[PDB]
Design a binder for this molecule. Structure first.
Ligand SMILES: COC[C@H]1O[C@@H](O)[C@H](O)[C@@H](OC)[C@@H]1O
Ligand SMILES: COC[C@H]1O[C@@H](O)[C@H](O)[C@@H](OC)[C@@H]1O
Ligand SMILES: COC[C@H]1O[C@@H](O)[C@H](O)[C@@H](OC)[C@@H]1O
Ligand SMILES: COC[C@H]1O[C@@H](O)[C@H](O)[C@@H](OC)[C@@H]1O
Ligand SMILES: COC[C@H]1O[C@@H](O)[C@H](O)[C@@H](OC)[C@@H]1O
Ligand SMILES: COC[C@H]1O[C@@H](O)[C@H](O)[C@@H](OC)[C@@H]1O
Ligand SMILES: [Cl-]
Ligand SMILES: [Cl-]
Ligand code: NA
Ligand code: NA
Ligand code: NA
Ligand code: NA
Lengths: 344, 344
């Protein structure tokens, strides 16, 4: 099992609007977007992209600005749907085949080719990629092996090498990396040790280091980071304390200070942030209230403010954001969302 | 002729350090970099990359994080030098041949291939590109025609199409764009009218629109923007007032508010900024003091603060940056820099 998942995928679009993707009771993918590129913009409301999915739907932005959404289908294949033009209309759902047993994880190679990572029936990590920048057709499926028990997460190093993170059968954090940008050549799997009870979250720091956050065996938030830009050795695990009842979400303030969000024991949203600078010590955990039934999802908007989404007790998506002094009261974006995570 | 040029090229590197490139009295390219990814970091001091150049040296970051510097040689060919590894050592200077009559202008295509633009002996716009992502070999040279009387500037649209801007023989702003990302297919040249007396500066707004700044016939700062994301029609010219005696420089605050810098009639650095938000009205012009002998060069650092470089009366490079309340007093980074601009 893993800590309670994020309920939506969010992106800050090429025209600076937040757009959220979730799963309805009907197992279709629904999306909601800001009208305007500003904190507190009015929202479209929920509209259906249809499909029938059995994973979290995961949006990624192509290097040409076109959104593309990846999800496991009811047939256990990887499916996708994409904008035919930047912030315009959508394709039909198309199958990329395979059989997958996790949420997909996506990143652009330095050459503009999306690469998708997902667990297989064998609990190994599999991958498939665009054969040309921001376009089909796609490569054959292949395996990067391992034995994983969490959803995988991918990020790019500051030298353009993709790196993937996942929990192992021993409940340690494991990782594997490209040996060169855009490559089909990967490292061996390596253990970063620890005992983790959530999906891992990966972010690039202002100084080009990967930093991974995960819930610990004690339900505290832990983190570990590359000690040199795009390189090991890693720091070894450090606790950020708290007692959290969901997966964490992490985003960068516009001054690059990291901020972590998670559900607390009182079912409120809690957060901890770097103080002073992106090199600064972490704050005490503080409450942002709400009563939430999912992990929070955090994103920086076009005004450089953090916005956080979470499911409420009514199964609506609710939203709070940074103000000059504080955070805004929770508002409802409505909808009825399910946790469709392929791993729970 | 054109307004007095920027003296350096600056980048925020893949490990969040500012690195500045200039030309010495010896016509070699010199560089200076922050030790640490923070406002007020100590600097390396000036070190030589050698070469013998007759343009502003222009640094660009490859999609794999490797810096690459482009300059016209004393032989009037395009030359370049690149990091062999991300924030590591440098190649030898290599010729990309051709004959050019402007500073080079560089952007990455969505597929990771750098494309370089420079004026020819015929005063047409010429271009050359990497044949593969972040690597040689390079394409043949070819012309995009036109007749230009300023250094060209290139930016990518929010839909991944490169667009180039330059002053025409009629002193209007002209532009030309790719018809598709990564394409060799371009539009016809189109006039945006106006009368401009500086190189144009181009920036992408938070909402995915190109906005161009240039000095006017009245030595005021003017600007014009795409009215729709990655699309015409354009806004038509609007004055931001001031009386400026250098080219302008523009950067984005970490909340995406645009800020323009230029030398004033008193030879001090002056600036004007968007107030409230990236959609907000522009401030009155205010002084940041100094006595400068170049256009300013503006960049946002890893702490989300603007830093501005300018040549002093002693021909040293000086530096001021945003503080909580104000701006820091000018400090000297030393060196002896010349304006090597291929167009003055
Ligand atoms: C990232 O996991 C950190 C874990 O490190 C382990 O070595 C500790 O025994 C354990 O403490 C209960 C932590 O959860
Ligand atoms: C973020 O959740 C907002 C919640 O606010 C709570 O105070 C309400 O009782 C409850 O009302 C349905 C909401 O779910
Ligand atoms: C994201 O919300 C989608 C839901 O919208 C609701 O308004 C519908 O009643 C419901 O259809 C049964 C959908 O699941
Ligand atoms: C961008 O140039 C704006 C120019 O627009 C011209 O139409 C004006 O006559 C002229 O006013 C003196 C401005 O410099
Ligand atoms: C940015 O320029 C700083 C200048 O400050 C001036 O106040 C000094 O007189 C002068 O001293 C050499 C410097 O060039
Ligand atoms: C960027 O500064 C480079 C200059 O460094 C100076 O210290 C040297 O005297 C001078 O060599 C004649 C260089 O041009
Ligand atoms: Cl668990
Ligand atoms: Cl002039
Ligand atoms: Na954006
Ligand atoms: Na905060
Ligand atoms: Na950077
Ligand atoms: Na300012």
């Amino acid at each position: 099992t893993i800590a309670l998942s994020e309920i939506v995928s969010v992106v800050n679009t090429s025209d600076g609007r937040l757009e959220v993707f979730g799963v309805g009771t009907d197992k279709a993918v629904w999306h909601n977007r800001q009208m305007a590129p500003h904190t507190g913009s009015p929202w479209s409301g929920w509209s259906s992209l249809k499909g029938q999915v059995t994973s979290k739907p995961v949006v990624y932005i192509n290097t040409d600005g076109r959104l593309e959404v990846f999800a496991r289908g009811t047939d256990n294949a990887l499916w996708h749907i994409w904008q035919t033009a930047t912030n315009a209309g959508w394709s039909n759902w198309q199958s990329l085949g395979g059989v997958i047993t996790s949420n997909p994880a996506i990143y652009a190679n330095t050459d503009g080719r999306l690469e998708v990572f997902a667990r297989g029936a064998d609990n190994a990590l599999w991958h498939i990629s665009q054969t040309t920048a921001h376009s089909g057709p796609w490569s054959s499926w292949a395996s990067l092996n391992g034995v994983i028990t969490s959803n995988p997460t991918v990020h790019i190093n500051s030298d353009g090498r993709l790196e993937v993170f996942a929990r192992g059968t021993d409940n340690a954090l494991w990782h594997i990396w490209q040996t060169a940008p855009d490559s089909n050549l990967w490292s061996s799997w390596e253990s970063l040790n620890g005992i983790i009870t959530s999906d891992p979250v990966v972010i690039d720091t202002a100084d080009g280091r990967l930093e991974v956050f995960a819930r610990g065996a004690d339900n505290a938030l832990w983190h570990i980071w590359q000690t040199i830009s795009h390189s090991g050795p890693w720091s070894g695990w450090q606790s950020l304390n708290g007692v959290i009842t969901s997966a964490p979400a992490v985003a960068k303030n516009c001054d690059n200070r990291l901020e972590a969000f998670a559900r607390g024991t009182d079912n409120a949203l809690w957060h901890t942030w770097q103080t002073v600078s992106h090199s600064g010590p972490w704050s005490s955990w503080q409450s942002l209230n709400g009563v939430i039934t999912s992990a929070p999802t955090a994103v920086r908007d076009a005004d450089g403010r953090l916005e956080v989404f979470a499911r409420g007790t009514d199964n609506a998506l609710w939203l709070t954001w940074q103000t000059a002094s504080s955070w805004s009261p929770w508002i409802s974006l409505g909808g009825v969302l399910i946790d469709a995570s392929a791993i729970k």
